[PDB]
């Protein structure tokens, strides 16, 4: 057939979204090659990207559906397994309404599968009990940055920090995780850019920094409060910015004026505090790289120094999962439909109803991952898990196992036989990133294409196909979407932003950044261009008091 064919794809291992070539010989992925054309990484990959191809053709991959029949799983046909799932979901619905079910997907999955998953969870039985890894993962920082600015995403890109004078890494292992985001720090120091690292431990990304600052762990609020106190005290705040685009300054004033001497809390001497504070406030264009109160303090700093809406500046919280941003965008949260359209507002609730040809959408705040797992027997019973391994990921794994065994009809879709699989009643095999054909979304809001290299191992299918077949079994209208392009077009019709991100535009190696409202718009690589995304269009900066644990 084919000998050494190159297929361009996105790396599935973190939020940088590096591009790579998979080498496919006789329908087998046999290696990973650089793609020098990519703007994100210029053909450069970390160890994970270099060896992403190893797990694709493992013998352990699930090949056919499995059904727990009075013990060990026996081999089932697709029709059999799907009819079983449809029957059990139907009965649990008809007995316990929409509260009885529970959905959660992984951030490993492509945008089209996250969107169709949340569409399945809402168009059919109307439940907002949909969620994903981002809760239990490191950062609920999206909510905090949303409160500060309006969009919880990173304000600027990665190439953008090359334009600053004062990259300020803060508590980030940006070279251990996101190494090709830390490549920007390496390039910047080669260009001679002031770099200040502030992690509690001397990490390999703190080696690159001109100044390194220890502080006692769990004291970010105190340290940032001190820095803002000195900025206010010597008046290096940005008056036009604060008076024009920011609100809450008096509250910040009261809250911070109690942090003149905080050496007791954080270990940083007042001399070093003044040094970093004045370097940051004096830098004309300074970018913060972060990795709830902790992220709102960063928003406080950026708003206080007027470092937001411009090239070479901003706040860039690093995500960590390959498609966590994409899942949140597609609307795999309890409270947002898609593109962060809140379900609390009847306006877009009715817009969803009209677009999806369904009625009486829930509008109540769903149950997050831990909410579901804790109430996994009390009112929730019946659970579809799209790619999670909760027994290995959640803390108190034994409690997780107890709750899952308290559960009626778990369904698990995975590419491998995990530990959570033993507790499933049905196991639907899935496809990995080399067999899907969707899109990922980087941490810098960039939509990248994933391309099909090989076929799923045996009888395994990809998630859009599985969910469409299940919805056709259960009699649900609106899941007639045979391709990732059709799923994407349905999503685009639904969402106001991302309306310009057609696949003919995503076939560009550059990709598209998420606020792309029209088809001629080139994208929005820098957010909050001259107005924010809150009610008055003005960022709010809050006063946080440090709580000792």
């Amino acid at each position: 057939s084919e000998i050494m064919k190159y297929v361009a794809t996105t790396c599935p291992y973190c939020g940088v979204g590096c591009t790579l070539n998979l080498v496919v010989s006789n329908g087998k992925v046999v290696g990973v090659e650089p793609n020098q054309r990519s703007p994100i990484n210029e053909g450069k990959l970390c160890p994970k990207g270099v060896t992403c191809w190893e797990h694709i053709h493992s013998p352990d991959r699930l090949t056919t559906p499995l059904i727990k029949k009075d013990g060990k799983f026996i081999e089932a046909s697709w029709d059999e397994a799907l009819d079983l799932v449809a029957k059990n979901l139907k009965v649990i619905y008809d007995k316990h309404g929409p509260k009885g079910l529970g959905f959660q997907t992984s951030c490993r999955t492509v945008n089209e599968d996250c969107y169709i998953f949340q569409k399945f969870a809402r168009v059919g039985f109307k439940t907002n009990n949909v969620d994903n890894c981002a809760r239990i993962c490191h950062g609920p920082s999206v909510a905090g940055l949303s409160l500060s600015f309006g969009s919880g995403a990173a304000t600027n890109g990665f190439e953008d920090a090359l334009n600053a004078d004062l990259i300020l890494i803060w508590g980030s292992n940006a070279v251990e995780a996101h190494p090709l985001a830390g490549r920007r720090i390496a390039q910047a120091k080669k260009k001679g850019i002031q770099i200040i690292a502030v992690d509690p431990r001397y990490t390999m990304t703190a080696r690159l920094a001109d100044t390194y600052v220890r502080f006692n762990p769990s004291t970010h609020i105190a340290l940032a409060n001190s820095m803002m106190y000195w900025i206010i005290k010597e008046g290096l705040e940005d008056k036009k910015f604060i008076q024009d685009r920011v609100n809450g300054f008096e509250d910040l004033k009261k809250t911070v004026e109690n942090y003149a001497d905080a050496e007791a809390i954080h270990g940083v001497p007042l001399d070093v505090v003044k040094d970093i504070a004045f370097r940051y406030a004096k830098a004309k264009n300074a970018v913060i790289i972060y990795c709830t109160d902790n992220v709102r303090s960063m928003g406080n700093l950026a708003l206080l120094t007027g470092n937001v809406g411009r090239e070479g500046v901003g706040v860039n919280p690093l995500r960590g999962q390959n498609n966590v941003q994409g899942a949140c965008d597609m609307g795999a949260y309890p409270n947002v439909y898609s593109g962060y359209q809140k379900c609390e507002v009847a306006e877009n609730r009715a817009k969803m109803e009209k677009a999806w040809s369904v009625t009486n959408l829930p509008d109540w705040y769903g149950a997050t991952l831990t909410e579901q797992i804790n109430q996994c027997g009390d009112e929730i019973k019946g659970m579809y898990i799209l790619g999670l391994n909760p027994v290995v990921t959640y803390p108190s794994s034994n409690h997780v196992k107890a709750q899952l065994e308290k559960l009626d009809f778990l369904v698990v879709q995975d590419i491998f036989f995990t530990e959570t699989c033993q507790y499933a009643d049905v196991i639907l095999p899935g496809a990995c990133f080399a067999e899907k054909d969707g899109t990922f979304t980087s941490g810098e809001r960039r939509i990248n294409r994933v391309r099909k290299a090989v076929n799923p191992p045996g009888q395994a299918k990809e998630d859009i196909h599985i969910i469409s077949e299940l919805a056709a079994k259960m009699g649900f209208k609106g899941f007639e979407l045979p391709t990732a392009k059709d799923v994407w077009d349905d999503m685009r019709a639904v969402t106001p932003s991302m309306f310009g991100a057609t696949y003919e535009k995503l076939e560009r190696p550059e990709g598209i950044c998420w606020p792309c409202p029209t088809e001629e718009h080139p994208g929005t690589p820098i957010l909050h261009r001259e107005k924010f995304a809150t009610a008055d269009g003005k960022g709010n900066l809050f006063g946080i008091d440090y709580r000792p644990p």
């Binding site: 000998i3 050494m4 064919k5 190159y6 361009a8 070539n21 080498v23 010989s25 046999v30 290696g31 090659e33 650089p34 020098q36 054309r37 990519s38 703007p39 990484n41 210029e42 053909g43 450069k44 990959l45 970390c46 160890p47 270099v50 070279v175 251990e176 190494p179 090709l180 490549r183 390496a186 390039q187 080669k190 390999m204 080696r207 690159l208 076939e507 190696p509």
Partner: protein, 411 residues
């Protein structure tokens, strides 16, 4: 026609001759070899996307080489290591491969180390005056040329300037001016001196073609009997036209080659003294190499690194988990590669941490060369440590005029 002839060559097929960068002779020769069954496949470069994307391609259908026609100056890749990894080193199948000077040198390095079969491989070599990274070319065009890069149709380095053809006209800027401003050819391409691959089987270029054929003929130099046979077969079956080259063309070809040698020497100088001398060079090297995150891209991309397991992976040399890795990691590559480095730049350009691997390695290589007199990538000469000789060892000890190896070795 016989191993040393210098010819003008263009394709009989008008479409092949249009799509060739010059006369289409590389694409006519490759097509002929494939369809007359000298070779079982053809490894060439095609555009996968915009002309800034160069994708290697194994082609077995003779109908697909018209897609390979044209030269991509943003193709900074290296072919021979892909043939060893995913084509079993050409141990069972004949191939015909289009290659630049660095790609011919890499072929010879891997054949020295027994990793490919040059009896099976046919190397059609192209002249190379330099390659540009695709993304750097984009930034060049956006900033210095003041053009939207997606507008460009074709783009080439001709007469030492960067001609781009966009909608509206064409432009040109001296590559030396660009290279001073911080753009241009890759660093190793600036230092390169393998301009006409005379170690390949055929050397094709646009240098020395003068007069009525200045854009519709390829200057061919027949560098081996295998290439002579390929050319004679193509000319007889009528896929290729041959006229003897013009002596004035040969002369100015020699002059341009010599000038490119001098420019390469100048860049070698300014770069190697830019690295420093004494303990300053050790702080440059050590502080740069402290960035390495052990992605091993430099090892996997180097043509000379053919080892099943690198010694950089052995726990008695490098501690497995310590990430701010030792200088031993790069000392083990200086020791193993620097004697034969072909200055391909792959190690430098695939490094996520932007470490000047190629600059360090070539700075060591140039004077390992002027010490032992071994030029990498030219022929089947075994590596310096794979062939030690009694008389030569006596000679270097006597030349030091000393009873040991301590001093009077360098000037």
């Amino acid at each position: 026609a016989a191993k040393g002839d210098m010819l003008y060559a263009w394709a009989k097929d008008a479409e092949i001759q249009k799509k060739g960068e010059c006369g289409g002779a590389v694409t006519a020769l490759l097509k002929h070899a494939l369809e007359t069954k000298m070779v079982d496949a053809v490894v060439a470069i095609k555009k996968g996307k915009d002309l800034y994307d160069a994708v290697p391609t194994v082609i077995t259908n003779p109908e697909d080489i018209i897609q390979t026609a044209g030269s991509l100056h943003c193709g900074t890749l290296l072919i021979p290591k892909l043939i060893k990894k995913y084509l079993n080193g050409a141990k069972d199948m004949k191939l015909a491969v289009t290659c630049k000077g660095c790609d011919a040198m890499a072929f010879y390095e891997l054949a020295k180390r027994n990793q490919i079969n040059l009896d099976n491989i046919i190397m059609i070599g192209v002249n190379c005056g330099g390659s540009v990274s695709p993304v750097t070319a984009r930034k060049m065009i956006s900033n210095k040329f003041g053009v939207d890069p997606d507008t460009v149709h074709k783009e080439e380095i001709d007469k030492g300037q960067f001609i781009i053809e966009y909608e509206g006209g064409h432009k040109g800027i001296k590559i030396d001016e660009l290279e001073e401003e911080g753009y241009g050819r890759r660093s190793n391409c600036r230092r390169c001196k393998m301009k006409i691959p005379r170690q390949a089987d055929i050397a094709a270029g646009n240098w020395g073609v003068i007069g009525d054929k200045a854009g519709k003929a390829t200057f061919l130099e027949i560098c081996s009997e295998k290439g002579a046979n390929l050319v004679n077969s193509a000319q007889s079956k009528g896929a290729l036209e041959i006229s003897p080259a013009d002596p004035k063309g040969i002369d100015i070809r020699a002059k341009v080659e010599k000038a490119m040698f001098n420019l390469g020497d100048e860049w070698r100088h300014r770069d190697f003294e830019g690295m420093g001398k004494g303990k300053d060079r050790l702080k440059l090297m050590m502080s740069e190499s402290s960035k390495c995150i052990k992605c091993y891209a430099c090892v996997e991309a180097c043509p000379i690194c053919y080892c099943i397991e690198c010694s950089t992976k052995k726990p008695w040399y490098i501690a497995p988990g310590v990430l701010p890795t030792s200088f031993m990691f790069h000392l083990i590559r200086f020791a193993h590669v620097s004697d034969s480095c072909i200055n391909c730049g792959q190690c430098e350009e695939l490094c996520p941490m932007e470490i000047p691997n190629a600059l360090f390695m070539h700075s060591q290589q140039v004077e390992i060369e002027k010490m032992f007199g071994h030029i990498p990538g030219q022929d089947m000469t075994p590596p310096i440590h794979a062939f030690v000789e009694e008389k030569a060892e006596r000679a270097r000890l006597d030349a030091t005029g000393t009873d040991s190896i301590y001093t009077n070795i360098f000037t």
